[PDB]
Symmetry: C3
Subunit: 243 residues, 3 copies
């Protein structure tokens, strides 16, 4: 690939060199590998979480008695494990022969944690089998160990899908990069009150923006649109997961 020409940055002013942690460097390398290997498409959708939010906030009592904080992330994780079982092409990887997909029969999901040293994506195993408070507990633990560098490499392996939530900082949407060999990643941004037409007038609903980037070699456009739609449907009523 052509290299970027070097520039004497100091011709233009004072410069200072700060170095990259080995974590940054690793991260850099892996992102570039994915970028060049995966033809990326991002599919955007908005989900109506007005009722999810109300539920979340009402279980604050129960969550506190169990020692967890109930955030949107366990809810996101549960709904995506369910969908990853329904739409198995999203829970698979392109086999090295380029002619086969390896469908995984297990659902382990990573979530992005931004730490001082760089990005870590701890993995929760068998998300499909854990309850909302189990997942809330575990997510937090893995997050604290990640910030504290106490996260052992084991816990960073064998994920099937990644959720990257920036909803806590802000933004309308973004286009995340697929962590190959996985085939998709869900970016989640800040929720806003939006007017949503009820057939007769505009009702304020709390809308969560979802950005699903996918490996277009493995997932086609219609499959991805169907995935964010189902997910919008599941978050609008999490009871459908009970069915």
């Amino acid at each position: 690939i052509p290299p970027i020409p070097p520039v004497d940055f100091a011709k233009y002013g004072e410069i200072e060199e700060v170095p990259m942690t080995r974590l940054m460097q690793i991260g850099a390398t892996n992102l570039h590998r994915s970028w060049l290997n995966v033809p990326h498409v991002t599919q955007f959708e908005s989900a109506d979480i007005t009722e999810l939010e109300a539920f979340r906030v009402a279980q604050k009592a129960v969550a506190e008695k169990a020692g967890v904080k109930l955030t949107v992330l366990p809810l996101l994780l549960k709904a995506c494990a369910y969908l990853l079982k329904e739409l198995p092409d999203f829970n698979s990887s392109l086999a090295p022969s380029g002619q086969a997909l390896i469908r995984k029969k297990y659902v382990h999901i990573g979530f992005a944690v931004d730490t001082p040293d760089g990005l870590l994506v701890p993995v929760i195993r068998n998300v499909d089998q854990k309850s909302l408070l189990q997942l809330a507990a575990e997510a937090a633990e893995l997050a604290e160990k990640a910030r504290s560098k106490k996260l052992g490499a084991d816990a960073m392996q064998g994920a099937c899908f990644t959720i990257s939530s920036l909803g806590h900082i802000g933004g309308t949407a973004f286009t995340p990069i697929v962590n190959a060999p996985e085939v998709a990643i869900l970016g989640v941004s800040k929720a806003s009150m939006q007017p949503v037409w009820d057939g007769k007038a505009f009702q304020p609903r709390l809308m969560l923006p979802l950005s699903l980037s996918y490996d277009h070699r493995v997932i086609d456009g219609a499959a991805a649109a169907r995935f964010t739609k189902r997910l919008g449907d599941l978050l609008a009523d999490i009871r459908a997961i009970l069915l």
Copy 2:
């Protein structure tokens, strides 16, 4: 390009291998070729189709008497053939010498059909010369032959531009990949009722999201913004095509 490291997926659970159809494999190869060759930008816009929709629905009678179904796709095709003649840099391809553009004086447009076996993009020739019911007829035929594998390779060649419509499944927008050697592709997503300021209050208008990805080597930002704007203008009043 660095390869993705192989992972023993079975360390983490039960895996199953399903194979890729030759169609998937072809598709995979071509998408990756475009991805690495084309510096991609997507330009997003929303078009007011309230009046297009009303027209569409009112001609249901005439369409039924002719045996066609009038969808938004013939309307999309007609308006883009008109624009492809107005803004010819979008109807061209980068010549192999990298120093010339080949402007095509003909307008043939492909549209994406997702079939069981993979993606096919049948091509309608001389879109600029056909009427809305001719195009509605032909689109359907090519679509049925595509699903039925009866589409002969001939009908998959020499397109100038591609429309990818996911409006029927859902979604807010996406970033499609350019089918090189073409220089642009129009993604269309689901139409929603949106509040649109009329200068004094917000009026509900039916808005169609458009996502135009383009080859930034050939098309610059202003040209693309001008293309989706004109298209938003043409769909808001299809009578401008008569002018």
Copy 3:
């Protein structure tokens, strides 16, 4: 990288060859270099410029007496120079060793001008030190020289960040390409009146869409979300720059 197969375009109709200016060719080459080198993510945000706009329009008198036109661009430039000093990772470049960042202690910003011959990105030096009317003056001058080919190569060097404004043509958002060796670019699109929930009802506010694409090797998701958020905050009240 696999080449695109040549197609005899004339099998399908009449073609005509027009050539590329040396400017287009240069541009093409550089964009492809960035594209293959930079793993790109775009972060989208909307900023409330209702009060910025009112200010802009009220200073029309003063601007006219000084001979400048006060557009949103000097306002954009001032606010980004301030942020580029606050969040220095955005004002830096990946050192050729891949293991260091070169933080620039100066703020020079380029802005995209689309000319007949291709794209030029004139650079304003030390944006952080100039006033809104100085910047309005200079932006215009560099723009006129650019259209008139009187822009000397000197003035196209050593920028730290680029703003690409298409707000004057239209569009909702786009995904700009990073001009490597810079690490980020701000795309700005057309401002619209939007309903924004005030806690009790929807208030019409003039919203400006911002699309920040960044080099994900150097900038992580949270840093970028934090940058467009701060920028949304600064444009909602430019007096925070005084602090």
